[PDB]
Design an enzyme around this catalytic site. Structure first.
Site, PDB file in Angstrom:
ATOM      1  N   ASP C  36       0.819  -1.207   0.000  1.00 55.87           N
ATOM      2  CA  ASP C  36       0.000   0.000   0.000  1.00 55.87           C
ATOM      3  C   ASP C  36       0.846   1.247   0.000  1.00 55.87           C
ATOM      4  O   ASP C  36       2.029   1.205   0.333  1.00 55.87           O
ATOM      5  CB  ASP C  36      -0.892   0.029   1.233  1.00 55.87           C
ATOM      6  CG  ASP C  36      -1.751  -1.208   1.358  1.00 55.87           C
ATOM      7  OD1 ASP C  36      -1.635  -2.109   0.500  1.00 55.87           O
ATOM      8  OD2 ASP C  36      -2.548  -1.280   2.316  1.00 55.87           O
ATOM      9  N   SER C  37       0.243   2.373  -0.353  1.00 52.57           N
ATOM     10  CA  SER C  37       0.977   3.624  -0.356  1.00 52.57           C
ATOM     11  C   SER C  37       1.663   3.790   0.975  1.00 52.57           C
ATOM     12  O   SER C  37       2.867   4.038   1.032  1.00 52.57           O
ATOM     13  CB  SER C  37       0.043   4.803  -0.624  1.00 52.57           C
ATOM     14  OG  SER C  37      -1.030   4.832   0.298  1.00 52.57           O
TER      15      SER C  37
END
Ligand SMILES: CCCCCCCCCCCCCCCCCC(=O)OC[C@H](COP(=O)([O-])OCC(O)COP(=O)([O-])OC[C@@H](COC(=O)CCCCCCCCCCCCCCCCC)OC(=O)CCCCCCCCCCCCCCCCC)OC(=O)CCCCCCCCCCCCCCCCC
Ligand SMILES: CCCCCCCCCCCCCCCCCC(=O)OC[C@H](COP(=O)([O-])OCC[N+](C)(C)C)OC(=O)CCCCCCCCCCCCCCCCC
Ligand SMILES: CCCCCCCCCCCCCCCCCC(=O)OC[C@H](COP(=O)(O)OCCN)OC(=O)CCCCCCCCCCCCCCCCC
Ligand SMILES: NC(=O)C1=CN([C@@H]2O[C@H](COP(=O)(O)OP(=O)(O)OC[C@H]3O[C@@H](n4cnc5c(N)ncnc54)[C@H](OP(=O)(O)O)[C@@H]3O)[C@@H](O)[C@H]2O)C=CC1
Ligand SMILES: CCCCCCCCCCC[C@H](O)CC(=O)SCCNC(=O)CCNC(=O)[C@H](O)C(C)(C)COP(=O)(O)O
Ligand code: SF4
Ligand code: SF4
Lengths: 198, 114, 75, 157, 385, 92, 95, 339, 178
Positions: C36-37
């Site tokens: 994920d970011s």
């Protein structure tokens, strides 16, 4: 019936016009209550300019900030109504400059114009949630350190959503959703009959 | 539409700020668990940080995001400049409260109004 | 540099979510291995420790593959 | 008289008298009830006469008078100070703000009673509970401390 | 500057103040007072209560000046209704307004000394305080938290005989103030710990909104009681005690001088209080007399509606400020036509004063901070509201 | 011995109390000023020493030299103090 | 009171004041309790004539604020006349 | 019965009126906690002076906790306590046979009379607590006597649940504090050098929650649950681990039990709550029994909590300023023994 | 009218006599001795304290003290459940629910004053038309348990019966004023 002198309602009225003329870019409405109190109303952008003119003008010195508050009219698009009440020890008169701010449209801070506002602006953020740009240190003042929600908003429950008790198992104070043992009895008090034209 | 920008002109710039705050909290979790003698695991806490940072993942509007970090930053300040003692921090973990089931049958069996 | 790359790989290998199998100097977890970011940011943080070097977000965002990390770590 | 029971009744009577005669009050000075006790400390109703000292640090403190509203920001502290008081310790809740929430019961920032935070021994009622009224409450603590029979319970335990 | 978090140590009290501070050894580098340890919701609670049932909240806002606070709400509600209290009630409010000022100053001067370390002045003057409370009780029923000054005048006329006793006391209290003096005004040591501590410039005092003795102590001449007269404080004659070389010692001297000047105002009020009624005659605003409500139908209806529903103040908003003993106490009371208020921001002389702690206690020792909290008469009820 | 007898009773009385007391119930604070004081203190404490024999030295046959010496010691230390005042020392 | 003269003299001297004249303790000078019954005066508006409320109800004869400068040569004007300087007291100017 | 209304927290109602005779205890404290949290009506029979039960007052809400004066020898006191309760929980137990109460009394004699009355009263269910691995032939008089009880009470009260907990792990517990307090002793004796007495601790809360869940579940009748734990341990790692978190030297030196039973006898002679007990000693080196039985935790609804997780809180008070800030991560874990 | 406190009107130039007087003030602590004299003086004054149990601090008739519900001389409780005592209570303390009694009269089935909630304002004393709820003189009702402080109709009626004689005297003294 209270005694009313129209000397003031005339003096203050004139001043209102004077302020308006001098600061027409921001003054939207300038009214004098029937209680002899002036209440210049300014566009939110005129916060810095209108105050400064009143703090530093020979014909209108308004040196101290009596109060900074924010009524919340939920109906009004711009929910909050920041009201700044100022006093002029030189001319023995008070004026109120009131602006409008919505929840996520911040107002400028006047800590520069009056450092009295350093605390009241933190008070308005904590209770109502208006944000003040360029504030030296904006942070909750009155509410608990972990409080979630802005309390004086008309949409916040009086009792709130959390209350504290000491739990032995965990040997530490612990929030729990509020459970009240006698709910606030909400007496309806408005009468179905009006009083006067007003 | 036609809104004025609070601090971030667009979700893009705003997201930059969220990244910074995440880092801040990430770097701080360990310290708090030690300066407050909290009985939690740094890893555990760091997941909590993630939880919160995503609880508000849905926000699409730039202005809402900007306030969210302002507020987020304020919380960090209360936990790194320590004015918030354990009771305050642990509350995040909702340790004492009994979890409520979200299963319909479960609620039916317990509460009049679900 | 190969050792540096090993350090980079080392860090990733440590991170839980990253899968040792998918991991490769050319893997871009943001788009490939599924990180994920926020996770990418966390990875950079671990790198900042292993390499004792700080990375500005502007550049850190640009680093989404291990190799890229190696390249930046390089300079 | 001659009986291990009589000796253990008389000696607690001694231990109870010492705690009863010398109660040092630790006064969480929240709100205004603290004033209505500053009047008890004052000359019309001296408390020292009764052995209660004007003010003692928490570590030295046999009683805790909680005067005033216990907000949700002072709660985490009261418990700390109660927890750090020496073991023999007693709590007197003064004011409808403290024993129950009083005006401000339904507030979001007020704990509805200190009983939720610290176990309470005597509850002194009244918005500004009168100063005699606190003095009656402190005297009621002394009646509660006389009745306690710790040594008797250890003997027949 | 190791943060000490002092103030949860009950060291200056006046309430509960967590004055987080950073001190390089015994020197204070920065003071960041924390507040809200006594926030209780007084401003939100009032929105859910009728005007007369919100009057008791004002006594609790700053309860060392129990009544003077009530006068500010009274005045405010009277303005919104454009009703004024009857002549006798006005004098009463000034009579008990001043008695209350003394009560506050006896609190502020003697509690200041207890923190400094002088303990005998507190016991000397708390006995005088006690005697005053008794006036409150024999007039209102409560020693403090009376609820006597209501929005349309006083609640009940003075008992038959109080004035005489508010004389005997006043006739003597002076000597009591004189004594404290012989113990502190010139003590070779009071001066040191107080003189040249927390000097505040005149321009800075107006800028930070100090508005109280704190301004008057710096030499700015402003007494809202002379500049903007409220009640019948216009008909009396008193001298504002202005100060120079403003510092803890000078302001103190000012507070001892207003104790003196208030005895001058009390004397007059006893000498010139008029025969008359103590509450407006508009059953619309003031509740009907109990003999009347028990014999006249219009009076019962007015009693029932007033107690159950309320004044029904006309829609408007006002900021009315009096000169509470601490400083300018003002209520901004926005009001819809409803019987219950819409907003009631209480301006607390004290929210502004605390803020100044930072700009006053700079490069000062731990003991200096204790002295300055005393010279601001901080009652955490008004600040926290 | 007589002193030893008294002193051990003195310690015994105190150790007795603390023992019953525990048995009956059943990081960087530094200011040179503080260090400086301690130092000054010994410089003065040493001087106290060089001044302590003065009671025996009064009876010294010389007398003139005694006083000439003692006056010089007191004066030179006091000047030390003087410079302490003049310098920021003693000004905390 | 009830003090042997000598103690009083010591008292007065040590204090430097005739504390006897103004004792703090109250003795038979305080208003006796059970003061006589009070017949309080009825104020105005109790007339039985020419007492129309419409002529004595400032509560709602009040009107909505007057508005100036709504958005929907000339001399300068101050908020009010400049304030008048306070004058030094005459009983006790200083101290 | 009492229909359960509310949202689930304090000031709500659950409908469990329950006498709990030994609430003042370490386990007890926890039992009243959940019962009070849930909103149940809790009657706490007490004998110690009011000062000591104050800790129970804030738990539970107003008029939810009622304290009654009660004497074990006096049958009448038990009679009135269960008059209006519908659930009776028995936690009466001690480790030191006291002058006026024998292991039989605290475990078998008293806990019988109690359930006996409870039936006369018509209480819906009785929960009796006896130590784990309690054979009628076990060495420790305590364990055997407890076994004797679980039988009897079944005849006074049929279908009476009998939870049988292992030694409990919790703040204020003995199992964990006892070993940690061996610090005062320069050397920490360990029979068989702390081997062959594998032990499975169980967090107090888990036990409490389990017990509470019993009160509010029809599935448990005549059930003899065994709350055990999330991991077993040879006494060696346990002892060292403890000393590990306490950050105090660990010096395992074996001590022949025959001699050690004597040491227990010594402290046992102590008038004020002997710290170790002959009956304790045996118990400590009494191996934990295996887990083949009506399951307790999990079975009754609570997932056990590993010891290492909360150990930090229980053993913190024993550290020194130097180690106070130290955390669990810094320290190492002990090793289990499926054996 | 203003007054300068601590303002030195002028610069008195030191005169030896003046200097000596001052130097003596610093050297021989003259003003400090002045302060000691004041405290020695009071040591000789009669102390103002009262034996609390034996003597009581004076409270006049309006003292609000502890709530009580009065009854008519006949024996019929005064309250007729109009419930405006509930309406004007600032703290929400009084809870009243009523139903027509068998006699057909109006009476309150439950009247509960939560004294911990009550802030003793005395408005209930004010509001009652029959003056059934009164602020009784007693202030000493401190209780060991929180529940005892909550008061139902039976405790208040009993409180009323116990203190009726003094309540009647107190109302007798102050009713002309009201
Ligand atoms: C010591 C020598 C005596 C001291 C003495 O008599 O002082 C009181 C006596 C009168 O003093 P006061 O302040 O006028 O007394 C208040 C009333 O006038 C007089 O007070 P009163 O009206 O209450 O008179 C009755 C009082 C009368 O009691 C006395 O006046 C004698 C007290 C003797 C104390 C010894 O007796 C009592 O009330 C009971 C207390 C009696 C003394 C209790 C303490 C005894 C201590 C014994 C061991 C020491 O002192 C003097 O005559 C001048 C002393 C100057 C000292 C410098
Ligand atoms: C009998 C009990 C007597 C108590 C006396 C002190 C309390 C009463 C004071 C009354 C008062 O107000 O006057 C003070 C008066 C008040 O004076 P003042 O301070 O207002 O001003 C006068 C002095 N000029 C004008 C020069 C500034 O103080 C003095 O008169 C001077 C006192 C000097 C004290 C010096 C230190 C104490 C003495 C030390 C040497 C040892 C003496 C003996 C010690 C004991 C031996 C057994
Ligand atoms: C040949 C010539 C001889 C000249 C002798 C002169 C007097 C001798 C003692 C002088 C002591 C030094 C002094 O002058 O006072 C110091 C101090 C006051 O100093 P201050 O006025 O603040 O000036 C500061 C300037 N930087 O003094 C103090 O402030 C002291 C602090 C107060 C402590 C209590 C004081 C009152 C004590 C009252 C009882 C005193 C009893 C003394 C005797 C007891 C019995 C022996
Ligand atoms: N490690 C553990 O704690 C384990 C406990 N158990 C069982 O769980 C139960 C609770 O254990 P725990 O709480 O530690 O025990 P405690 O030593 O804490 O005592 C429990 C309660 O029993 C009461 N009690 C003891 N003796 C008597 C008596 N003669 N008359 C009346 N009351 C008495 C005590 O009251 P007071 O103090 O007022 O006398 C106390 O409140 C015990 O019965 C035990 O058999 C089982 C396995 C492990
Ligand atoms: C152990 C102690 C626990 C304390 C945890 C911590 O202090 C509390 C906290 O997280 S403070 C609030 C954080 N909340 C934000 O900072 C706003 C996030 N804003 C978004 O999430 C947007 O929706 C976005 C478009 C960025 C989605 O993008 P993304 O999913 O983040 O990549
Ligand atoms: S109880 Fe009445 S007096 Fe005591 S604090 Fe709460 S309000 Fe102030
Ligand atoms: S007002 Fe008087 S009468 Fe009407 S209900 Fe309340 S108490 Fe009963």
């Amino acid at each position: 019936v209270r005694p009313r002198s129209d000397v003031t309602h005339k003096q203050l009225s004139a001043f209102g016009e004077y302020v308006a003329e001098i600061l027409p870019k921001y003054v939207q409405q300038v009214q004098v209550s029937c209680l002899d109190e002036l209440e210049i109303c300014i566009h939110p952008d005129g916060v810095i300019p209108t105050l400064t003119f009143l703090r530093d003008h020979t014909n209108a010195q308004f040196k101290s900030l009596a109060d900074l508050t924010a009524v919340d009219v939920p109906t009004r698009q711009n929910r909050f109504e920041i009201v700044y009440n100022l006093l002029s020890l030189r001319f023995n008169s008070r004026i109120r400059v009131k602006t409008y701010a919505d929840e996520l449209t911040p107002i400028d801070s006047i800590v520069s114009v009056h450092i009295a506002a350093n605390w009241y602006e933190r008070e308005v953020w904590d209770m109502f949630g208006v944000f003040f740009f360029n504030h030296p240190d904006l942070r909750r003042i009155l509410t608990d350190y972990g409080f979630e929600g802005h309390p004086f908003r008309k949409d916040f429950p009086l009792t709130g959503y959390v209350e504290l008790r000491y739990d032995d198992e965990v040997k530490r104070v612990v929030a729990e959703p509020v459970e009240l043992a006698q709910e606030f009895r909400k007496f309806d008090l408005n009468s179905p009959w009006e009083a006067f034209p007003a | 539409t036609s809104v004025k920008p609070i601090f971030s002109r667009d979700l893009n710039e705003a997201k930059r700020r969220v990244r910074e705050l995440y880092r801040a909290w990430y770097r701080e979790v360990p310290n708090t668990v030690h300066l407050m003698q909290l009985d939690i695991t740094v890893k555990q806490g760091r997941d909590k940080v993630r939880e919160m940072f995503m609880k508000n993942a849905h926000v699409t509007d730039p202005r809402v995001v900007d306030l969210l970090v302002i507020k987020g930053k304020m919380e960090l300040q209360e936990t790194i400049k320590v004015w918030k003692q354990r009771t305050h921090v642990m509350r995040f973990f909702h340790e004492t409260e009994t979890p409520r089931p979200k299963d319909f049958l479960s609620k039916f069996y317990m509460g009049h109004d679900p | 540099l190969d050792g540096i790359k090993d350090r980079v790989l080392y860090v990733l290998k440590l991170y839980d979510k990253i899968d040792p199998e998918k991991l490769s100097v050319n893997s871009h977890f943001m788009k490939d291995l599924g990180l994920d970011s926020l996770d990418q940011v966390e990875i950079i943080m671990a790198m900042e420790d292993e390499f004792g070097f700080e990375i500005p977000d502007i550049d850190a965002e640009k680093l989404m593959c291990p190799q890229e990390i190696v390249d930046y770590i390089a300079d | 008289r001659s009986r291990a029971e009589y000796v253990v009744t008389k000696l607690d009577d001694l231990i109870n008298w010492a705690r009863r005669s010398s109660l040092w009050p630790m006064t969480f000075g929240l709100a205004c009830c603290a004033v209505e006790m500053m009047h008890m400390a004052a000359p019309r109703y001296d408390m020292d006469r009764f052995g209660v000292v004007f003010r003692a640090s928490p570590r030295q403190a046999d009683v805790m008078i909680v005067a005033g509203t216990l907000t949700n920001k002072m709660a985490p502290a009261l418990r700390k100070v109660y927890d750090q008081m020496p073991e023999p310790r007693y709590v007197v809740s003064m004011g409808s703000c403290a024993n129950g929430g009083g005006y401000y019961h339904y507030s979001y920032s007020v704990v509805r009673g200190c009983d939720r935070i610290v176990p309470v021994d005597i509850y002194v009622p009244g918005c500004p509970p009168t100063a005699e009224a606190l003095l009656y409450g402190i005297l009621q603590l002394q009646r509660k401390i006389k009745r306690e029979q710790k040594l008797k319970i250890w003997y027949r335990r | 500057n190791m943060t000490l978090n002092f103030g949860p140590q009950h060291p200056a009290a006046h309430g509960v103040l967590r004055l987080v501070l950073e001190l390089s050894g015994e020197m204070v580098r920065k003071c960041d007072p924390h507040i809200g340890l006594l926030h209780r919701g007084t401003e939100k609670l009032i929105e859910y209560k009728t005007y007369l049932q919100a009057l008791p909240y004002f006594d609790r806002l700053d309860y060392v000046s129990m009544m003077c606070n009530e006068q500010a709400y009274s005045i405010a509600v009277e303005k919104l209704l454009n009703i004024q209290p009857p002549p006798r009630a006005q004098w009463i409010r000034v009579l008990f307004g001043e008695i209350t000022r003394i009560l506050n100053h006896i609190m502020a001067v003697t509690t200041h000394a207890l923190d400094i370390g002088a303990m005998t002045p507190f016991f000397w003057m708390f006995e005088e305080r006690e005697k005053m409370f008794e006036f409150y009780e024999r007039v209102s029923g409560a020693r403090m938290h009376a609820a006597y000054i209501r929005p349309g005048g006083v609640h009940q006329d003075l008992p038959l005989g109080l004035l005489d006793d508010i004389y005997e006391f006043s006739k003597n209290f002076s000597l009591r103030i004189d004594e404290v003096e012989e113990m502190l005004t010139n003590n070779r040591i009071w001066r040191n710990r107080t003189v040249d501590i927390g000097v505040v410039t005149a321009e800075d005092a107006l800028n930070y909104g100090f508005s109280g003795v704190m301004l008057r102590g710096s030499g700015i001449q402003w007494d809202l009681r002379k500049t903007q007269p409220y009640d019948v404080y216009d008909q009396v004659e008193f001298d504002v005690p202005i100060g120079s070389r403003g510092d803890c010692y000078d302001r103190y001297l000012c507070r001892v001088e207003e104790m003196r000047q208030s005895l001058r105002i009390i004397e007059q009020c006893l000498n010139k209080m008029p025969p008359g009624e103590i509450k407006v005659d508009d059953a619309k605003v003031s509740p009907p007399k109990r003999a009347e409500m028990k014999t006249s139908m219009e009076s019962l209806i007015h009693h029932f509606k007033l107690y159950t529903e309320g004044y029904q103040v006309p829609p408007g908003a006002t900021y009315t400020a009096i000169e509470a003993p601490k400083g300018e106490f003002g209520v901004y009371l926005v009001s819809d036509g409803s019987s219950r208020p819409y907003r009631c921001k209480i301006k607390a002389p004290g929210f502004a004063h605390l803020a100044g702690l930072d700009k006053m206690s700079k490069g000062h020792m731990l003991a200096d901070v204790v002295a300055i909290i005393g010279t601001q008469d901080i009652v955490f009820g008004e600040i926290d509201r | 011995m007589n002193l030893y007898t008294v002193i051990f009773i003195n310690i015994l009385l105190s150790l007795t109390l603390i023992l019953v007391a525990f048995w009956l119930p059943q990081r960087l604070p530094f200011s040179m000023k503080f260090f400086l004081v301690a130092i000054t203190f010994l410089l003065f404490d040493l001087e106290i020493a060089l001044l302590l024999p003065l009671p025996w030295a009064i009876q010294t046959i010389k007398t003139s030299t005694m006083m000439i010496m003692a006056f010089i010691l007191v004066t030179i230390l006091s000047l030390g103090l003087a410079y302490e005042w003049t310098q920021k020392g003693l000004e905390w | 009171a009830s003090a042997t003269r000598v103690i009083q003299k010591l008292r007065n001297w040590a204090s430097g004041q005739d504390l006897q004249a103004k004792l703090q303790l109250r003795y038979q000078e305080i208003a006796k309790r059970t003061q006589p019954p009070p017949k309080l005066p009825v104020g105005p508006s109790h007339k039985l004539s020419n007492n129309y409320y419409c002529t004595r109800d400032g509560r709602r004869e009040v009107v909505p604020p007057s508005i100036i400068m709504s958005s929907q040569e000339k001399k300068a004007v101050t908020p009010a006349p400049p304030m008048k300087r306070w004058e030094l007291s005459k009983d006790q100017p200083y101290l | 019965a009492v229909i359960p209304h509310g949202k689930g927290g304090r000031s709500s109602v659950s409908g469990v009126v329950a006498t709990v005779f030994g609430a003042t205890g370490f386990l007890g404290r926890y039992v009243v906690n959940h019962l009070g949290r849930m909103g149940s009506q809790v009657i706490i029979p007490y004998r110690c002076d009011v000062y000591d039960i104050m800790h129970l007052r804030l738990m539970g809400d107003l008029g939810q906790l009622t304290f009654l004066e009660w004497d074990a020898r006096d049958k009448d006191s038990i009679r009135k306590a269960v008059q209006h309760s519908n659930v009776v929980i028995n936690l009466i137990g001690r480790e030191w046979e006291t002058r006026n109460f024998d292991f039989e009394d605290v475990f078998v004699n008293i806990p019988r009379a109690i359930a006996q009355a409870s039936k006369e009263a018509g209480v819906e269910r009785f929960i009796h607590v006896s130590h784990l691995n309690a054979s009628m032939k076990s060495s420790s008089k305590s364990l055997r006597s407890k076994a004797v009880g679980e039988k009897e009470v079944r005849s006074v009260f049929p279908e009476a649940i009998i939870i049988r907990p292992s030694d409990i792990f919790g703040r204020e517990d003995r199992f964990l504090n006892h070993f940690a307090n061996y610090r005062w002793f320069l050397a920490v004796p360990l029979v068989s050098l702390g081997f062959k007495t594998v032990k499975q601790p169980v967090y107090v809360a888990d036990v409490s929650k389990g017990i509470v869940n019993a009160t509010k579940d029809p599935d448990a009748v005549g059930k003899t649950f065994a709350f055990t734990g999330p991991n077993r341990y040879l006494l060696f790692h346990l002892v060292k681990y403890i000393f590990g978190m306490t950050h105090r030297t660990f010096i395992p030196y074996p001590l022949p039990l025959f001699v050690y039973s004597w040491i227990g006898k010594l402290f046992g002679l102590s008038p004020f709550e002997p710290w170790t007990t002959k009956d304790k000693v045996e118990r400590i080196h009494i191996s934990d029994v295996m887990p083949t039985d009506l399951p307790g935790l999990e079975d009754l609804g609570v997932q056990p909590t590993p010891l290492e997780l909360k150990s930090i809180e229980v053993l913190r008070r024993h550290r020194t300023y130097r180690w106070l800030s130290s955390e669990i991560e810094e320290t190492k874990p002990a090793k289990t023994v499926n054996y | 009218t203003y007054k300068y406190v601590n303002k030195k009107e002028q610069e008195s130039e030191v005169d030896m006599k003046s200097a000596t007087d001052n130097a003596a003030r610093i050297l021989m602590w003259t003003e400090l001795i002045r302060g000691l004299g004041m405290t020695l003086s009071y040591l000789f004054r009669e102390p103002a304290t009262i034996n609390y149990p034996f003597e009581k601090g004076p409270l006049s008739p309006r003292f609000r003290g502890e709530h009580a519900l009065r009854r008519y001389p006949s024996g019929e409780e005064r309250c007729i459940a109009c419930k405006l005592c509930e309406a004007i209570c600032p703290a929400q303390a009084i809870t009243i629910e009523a139903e027509p009694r068998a006699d057909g009269s109006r009476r309150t089935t439950r009247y509960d004053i939560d004294m911990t909630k009550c802030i003793y304002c005395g408005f209930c004393q004010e509001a009652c038309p029959v003056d059934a709820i009164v602020e009784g003189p007693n202030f000493e009702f401190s209780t060991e348990t929180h529940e005892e402080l909550l008061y139902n109709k039976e405790k208040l009626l009993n409180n009323g019966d116990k203190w009726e004689a003094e309540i009647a005297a107190n109302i007798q003294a102050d009713y002309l004023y009201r």
